[PDB]
């Protein structure tokens, strides 16, 4: 039976209209978890659902307990730093390195959509690497929001919004900047809805193929927006060199290995 006293506080990871995420250390073992603390006063589709959903690339919920005035979710913490971090230390990634990540993500999403669960939060800030270089889709923010257009026009969060998130994420990866990184900012609502996303000339025609498709404004048209869901994305020109079985098996080799001895190495815990 977990309890506040079973953990040591280290640092703040994130705050919010919902609560906050603390970086704590389970006092018994010594392992590190991220504790999501929710005001019972502020608040379902999050808990329970994500508690039993296990997956190589989805962060696992280690313990779940409640206080008399709050809800706590002690969850596993990747110690390979955050993708956003690494990406900025390189401006851009390789159409393969991207692809590596794009594939672990695609796997995570196929799983979730099979369980009839829409992630809603696939975005660069929610991505971290584990001690080995394998992606870990986290559930929180540690940047201009890029909601799917169907979310903007009809507050509609179906499967398709996960693919849009995918696309916007890979686009930043192979391009080093958001589709509309320079135009003001308050221009977003109108841009995302009615502006054609443009791609760098220096981009493999297949990669320009993927994005062009992960970013279709009509969910019905988007790549992965068809009844076949994740298959369209797994079976896209861009993803031929892929062993979708090797993915979920962590069989693939991360094209970059973070610099940490054991998961307990706490170096990527600063800036």
Curated annotation (Swiss-Prot):
Localization terms from the record: Cytoplasm; Nucleus; Cell membrane; Early endosome
Annotated keywords: Acetylation, Apoptosis, ATP-binding, Carbohydrate metabolism, Cell membrane, Cytoplasm, Developmental protein, Diabetes mellitus, Disease variant, Disulfide bond, Endosome, Glucose metabolism, Glycogen biosynthesis, Glycogen metabolism, Glycoprotein, Kinase, Manganese, Membrane, Metal-binding, Nucleotide-binding, Nucleus, Phosphoprotein, Proto-oncogene, Serine/threonine-protein kinase, Sugar transport, Transferase, Translation regulation, Transport, Ubl conjugation
Domain notes from UniProt: Binding of the PH domain to phosphatidylinositol 3,4,5-trisphosphate (PtdIns(3,4,5)P3) following phosphatidylinositol 3-kinase alpha (PIK3CA) activation results in AKT2 recruitment to the plasma membrane, exposition of a pair of serine and threonine residues for phosphorylation by membrane-associated PDPK1/PDK1 and activation.
Active site as annotated: 121 (proton acceptor)
Connected disease: Defects in AKT2 are a cause of susceptibility to breast cancer (BC). AKT2 promotes metastasis of tumor cells without affecting the latency of tumor development. May play a role in glioblastoma cell survival. Type 2 diabetes mellitus: A multifactorial disorder of glucose homeostasis caused by a lack of sensitivity to insulin. Affected individuals usually have an obese body habitus and manifestations of a metabolic syndrome characterized by diabetes, insulin resistance, hypertension and hypertriglyceridemia. The disease results in long-term complications that affect the eyes, kidneys, nerves, and blood vessels.
Sugar attachment sites: 143
Residue ranges of every copy of the Protein kinase domain listed in the record: 7-239
The keyword Membrane appears for this protein: yes
Main subcellular location of this protein, as a coarse class: cytoplasm
Gene name, Swiss-Prot/TrEMBL: AKT2
Positions contributing to ATP binding: 13-21, 36
Subunit text: Interacts with BTBD10. Interacts with KCTD20. Interacts (via PH domain) with MTCP1, TCL1A and TCL1B; this interaction may facilitate AKT2 oligomerization and phosphorylation, hence increasing kinase activity. Interacts with PHB2; this interaction may be important for myogenic differentiation. Interacts (when phosphorylated) with CLIP3/ClipR-59; this interaction promotes AKT2 recruitment to the plasma membrane. Interacts with WDFY2/ProF (via WD repeats 1-3).
GO biological process: cellular response to high light intensity; cellular response to insulin stimulus; fat cell differentiation; glucose metabolic process; glycogen biosynthetic process; insulin receptor signaling pathway; intracellular signal transduction; mammary gland epithelial cell differentiation
EC number: 2.7.11.1
Residues of the full protein shown: 146 to 441 of 481
Post-translational note: Phosphorylated and activated by PDPK1/PDK1 in the presence of phosphatidylinositol 3,4,5-trisphosphate. Ubiquitinated; undergoes both 'Lys-48'- and 'Lys-63'-linked polyubiquitination. TRAF6 catalyzes 'Lys-63'-linked AKT2 ubiquitination; this modification may be important for AKT2 recruitment to the plasma membrane and for AKT2 activating phosphorylation. When phosphorylated, undergoes 'Lys-48'-polyubiquitination catalyzed by TTC3 in the nucleus, leading to its degradation by the proteasome.
Membrane topology field: Peripheral membrane protein
UniProt note on regulation of activity: In adipocytes and hepatocytes, the activation is induced by insulin. Aminofurazans, such as 4-[2-(4-amino-2,5-dihydro-1,2,5-oxadiazol-3-yl)-6-{[(1S)-3-amino-1-phenylpropyl]oxy}-1-ethyl-1H-imidazo[4,5-c]pyridin-4-yl]-2-methylbut-3-yn-2-ol (compound 32), are potent AKT2 inhibitors. AKT2 phosphorylation of PKP1 is induced by insulin.
This protein's name: RAC-beta serine/threonine-protein kinase
UniProt-annotated binding residues for Mn(2+): 126, 139
Function: Serine/threonine kinase closely related to AKT1 and AKT3. All 3 enzymes, AKT1, AKT2 and AKT3, are collectively known as AKT kinase. AKT regulates many processes including metabolism, proliferation, cell survival, growth and angiogenesis, through the phosphorylation of a range of downstream substrates. Over 100 substrates have been reported so far, although for most of them, the precise AKT kinase catalyzing the reaction was not specified. AKT regulates glucose uptake by mediating insulin-induced translocation of the SLC2A4/GLUT4 glucose transporter to the cell surface. Several AKT2-specific substrates have been identified, including ANKRD2, C2CD5, CLK2 and PITX2. May play a role in myoblast differentiation. In this context, may act through PITX2 phosphorylation. Unphosphorylated PITX2 associates with an ELAVL1/HuR-containing complex, which stabilizes CCND1 cyclin mRNA, ensuring cell proliferation. Phosphorylation by AKT2 impairs this association, leading to CCND1 mRNA destabilization and progression towards differentiation. Also involved in the negative regulation of myogenesis in response to stress conditions.
GO molecular function per UniProt: ATP binding; metal ion binding; molecular function activator activity; protein serine kinase activity; protein serine/threonine kinase activity
Family under the similarity heading: Belongs to the protein kinase superfamily. AGC Ser/Thr protein kinase family. RAC subfamily.
Reactions this protein catalyses: L-seryl-[protein] + ATP = O-phospho-L-seryl-[protein] + ADP + H(+); L-threonyl-[protein] + ATP = O-phospho-L-threonyl-[protein] + ADP + H(+)
Effect of residue 36 to A: Loss of kinase activity
One annotated Gene Ontology cellular component of this protein: nucleoplasm
């Amino acid at each position: 039976k977990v309890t506040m006293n079973d953990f040591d506080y280290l640092k703040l990871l994130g705050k919010g209209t919902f609560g906050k995420v603390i970086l704590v250390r389970e006092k018994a073992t010594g392992r590190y978890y991220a504790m999501k603390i929710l005001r019972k006063e502020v608040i379902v589709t999050e808990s329970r659902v994500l508690q039993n959903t296990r997956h190589p690339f989805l962060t696992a919920l280690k313990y779940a307990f409640q206080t008399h005035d709050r809800l706590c979710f002690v969850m596993e913490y990747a110690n390979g730093g955050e993708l956003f971090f690494h990406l900025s230390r390189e401006r851009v990634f390789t159409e393969e390195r991207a692809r590596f990540y794009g594939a672990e993500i695609v796997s995570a999403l196929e799983y979730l959509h099979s369980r009839d669960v829409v992630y809603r939060d696939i975005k660069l800030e929610n991505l971290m690497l584990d001690k080995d270089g394998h992606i870990k889709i986290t559930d929180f923010g540690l940047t201009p929001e890029y909601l799917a257009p169907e979310v903007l026009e009809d507050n509609d969060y179906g499967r398709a919004v996960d693919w849009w998130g995918l696309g916007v994420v890979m686009y930043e990866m192979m391009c080093g900047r958001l589709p509309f990184y320079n135009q003001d900012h308050e221009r977003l609502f109108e841009l995302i809805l009615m502006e054609e996303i443009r791609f760098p000339r220096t981009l493999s025609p297949e990669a320009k193929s993927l994005l062009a498709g992960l970013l279709k404004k009509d969910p019905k048209q988007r790549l992965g927006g068809g009844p076949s869901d994740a298959k369209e994305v797994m079976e896209h020109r861009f993803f031929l060199s892929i062993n979708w079985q090797d993915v979920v098996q962590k069989k693939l080799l991360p094209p970059f290995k973070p610099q940490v001895t054991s998961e307990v190495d706490t170096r990527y815990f600063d800036d």
